[PDB]
């Protein structure tokens, strides 16, 4: 009775005061997770504007192995440009149009 | 008395409950937080690398006494080109690619 109650209240006093705390610093950590989440699409669409027209057929003449790829273009020139993560040199062979 | 013990008991397990459904829930955004930041950062220096205007290949198809460098384009036509500071014209002799 008076000592049942009085220890469950008790437990769940300095219980809340804990959580509270705990909640109002979670809230700050949402801001910055829209902030991110947004930056994320706006650089996968920096992606996009290389993977939408105009496009230009060239075939991979060669490879160096400091990570830059060499293709003879169609338009001429054999030139040198440098890799991604999006698509490697493992999935590129000198006779491939790319 | 043991009837002021209850509302108050009832208060504090109603707010405790309150503040730990929303921590969890924020905990979910928390992962995700991490999550993009990662995205953002590697997104961001992937984009550098292919948006980057290429190096054409040329090659020394001979080489003048005046400093200056016979470079036959693989774009089709021949320039005569100045050699930079920082490359040596003993580096340079026929067959050598630039």
Redesign the interface.
Known sequence: ??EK??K??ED??K??EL??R??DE??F??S??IR??R??RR??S??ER?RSPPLLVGVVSDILEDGRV?VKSST???????????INEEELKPGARV
Chains 1, 2 share one sequence.
């Open positions: 009775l008076l109650l009085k469950l209240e769940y006093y219980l809340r959580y509270r705990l909640e979670k809230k950590i949402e910055e997770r991110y989440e930056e994320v650089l996968r920096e992606v290389l060499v001429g020139p054999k030139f040198v440009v440098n890799t991604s993560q999006y």
